[PDB]
Design a protein around this ligand. Structure first.
Ligand SMILES: C=C1[C@@H](C)[C@H]2[C@H](Cc3ccccc3)NC(=O)[C@]23[C@H](OC(C)=O)/C=C/[C@@](C)(O)C(=O)[C@@H](C)C/C=C/[C@H]3[C@@H]1O
Ligand SMILES: Nc1ncnc2c1ncn2[C@@H]1O[C@H](COP(=O)(O)OP(=O)(O)OP(=O)(O)O)[C@@H](O)[C@H]1O
Ligand SMILES: [Ca+2]
Ligand SMILES: [Ca+2]
Length: 362
């Protein structure tokens, strides 16, 4: 056979490549644009913001507009990867606990619209655990539009213990824009949002102790970092560096009543059979671009520890390439001998119909 194609659809970015590679061949923005050709996808859809009405097909992880998603996939196949989908089995990723109806539309589009010889849909968080080389653990997947905690035991996810936190990279990006603005600068436009997203990714970090970090930055300049704008203006970022990602642990800074990532992780563990909570505590795996902040692991360690029984062994695993662990796990799974029997063949589709997805996929 040829290569399966691994397509990781995200809320902000989409990752695509060939099973067997250790990194996705292409990564582009999850946006489609039409007149305010007929449509535009990715970076070129943004540079035409003023003349195009932009839409975001994947919000908070769920596909909300199928015509748009279909265009993202068409763009992924012909423009990005430059392959014929009918000559490749396709593995798509999806968010945990998504509408059963969605899973059927994904299958249908892949077969009836792209004529894929075979496809499959897999929960992102599970792929990340596989990427870490485990079959048991609790993954904290945090991206650009949504965050989930997914307990997995012996290779299978535990639906009833999965939680969803609507706080991720996009919220943090805007929050950084707001505090720097309060600082004396002015970041409010979509063009500027792209700039603050870059600042956030390069100079932000999670303090081990908020207050102490605040005190150190209020009486010293030791934590300050300079950032240069394209036009040459140099701006300094002080406590914003850590105050921004702090919103993950304290959503209230954003007017949100939901509990932080550490507490949400703990809550997923408690929803699990007491017999496996230990395995989960010693195997808390970070995933997604938003778990990339320097210092986040040691902070998760300290916070989880404070929540769990004193006799509990805590361990936070923060893979270096966790910004793509989902896609990678997909690359790994698609090539698994034991996984081949899971693909949904076009034959299995013609006979059983779209509903075949609930049998082999879930
Ligand atoms: C990557 C996924 C699948 C490959 C399954 C995977 C186990 C597996 C691996 C290789 C070959 C066969 C099965 N681990 C899971 O949680 C899956 C596996 O799905 C199947 C069909 O086993 C688990 C299913 C349940 C019932 O546990 C679910 O939680 C279900 C609601 C969501 C789907 C989970 C599946 C996940 O998307
Ligand atoms: N080094 C970094 N530090 C902090 N944040 C980062 C870093 N690198 C990337 N990010 C953020 O990670 C987010 C993108 O992560 P990812 O691609 O995993 O999410 P997604 O799949 O696009 O969306 P979601 O999974 O929520 O549906 C963006 O907010 C990006 O700015
Ligand atoms: Ca994702
Ligand atoms: Ca609070």
């Amino acid at each position: 056979e040829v290569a399966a194609l691994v397509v990781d659809n995200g809320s902000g970015m989409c990752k695509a490549g060939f099973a067997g590679d250790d990194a996705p061949r292409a990564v582009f923005p999850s946006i489609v644009g039409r007149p305010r050709k007929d449509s535009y996808v990715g970076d070129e859809a943004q540079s035409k913001r003023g003349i195009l009405t932009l839409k975001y097909p994947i919000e908070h992880g769920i596909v909300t507009n199928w015509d748009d998603m279909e265009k993202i996939w068409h763009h992924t196949f012909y423009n990005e990867l430059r392959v014929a989908p009918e000559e490749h089995p396709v593995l798509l990723t999806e968010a945990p606990l998504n509408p059963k109806a969605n899973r059927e539309k994904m299958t249908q589009i892949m077969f009836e619209t792209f004529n894929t010889p075979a496809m499959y849909v897999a929960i992102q968080a599970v792929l990340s655990l596989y990427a870490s080389g485990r079959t048991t653990g609790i993954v904290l997947d945090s991206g650009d539009g949504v965050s989930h905690t997914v307990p997995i035991y012996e290779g299978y996810a535990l639906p009833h213990a999965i939680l969803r936190l609507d706080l991720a990279g996009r919220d943090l990006t805007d929050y950084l824009m707001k505090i720097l603005t309060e600082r004396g600068y002015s970041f409010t436009t979509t063009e500027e949002r792209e700039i603050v997203r870059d600042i956030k990714e390069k100079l932000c970090y999670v303090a081990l102790d908020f207050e102490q970090e605040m005190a150190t930055a209020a009486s010293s300049s030791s934590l300050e970092k300079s950032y240069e704008l394209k036009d040459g203006q140099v701006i300094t970022i002080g406590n914003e560096r850590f105050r921004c990602p702090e919103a993950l642990f304290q959503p209230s800074f954003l007017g949100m009543e939901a509990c932080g990532i550490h507490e949400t992780t703990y809550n997923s563990i408690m929803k699990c059979d007491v017999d496996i909570r230990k395995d989960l505590y010693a195997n808390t795996v970070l995933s997604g671009g938003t778990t990339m902040y320097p210092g986040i692991a040691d902070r998760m360690q300290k916070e989880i520890t404070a929540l769990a029984p004193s006799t509990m062994k805590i361990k936070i695993i923060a893979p270096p390439e966790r910004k793509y662990s989902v896609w990678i796990g997909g690359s790994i799974l698609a090539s698994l001998s034991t996984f081949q029997q899971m693909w949904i063949s076009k034959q299995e589709y013609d006979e059983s119909g779209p509903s075949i997805v609930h049998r082999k996929c879930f």
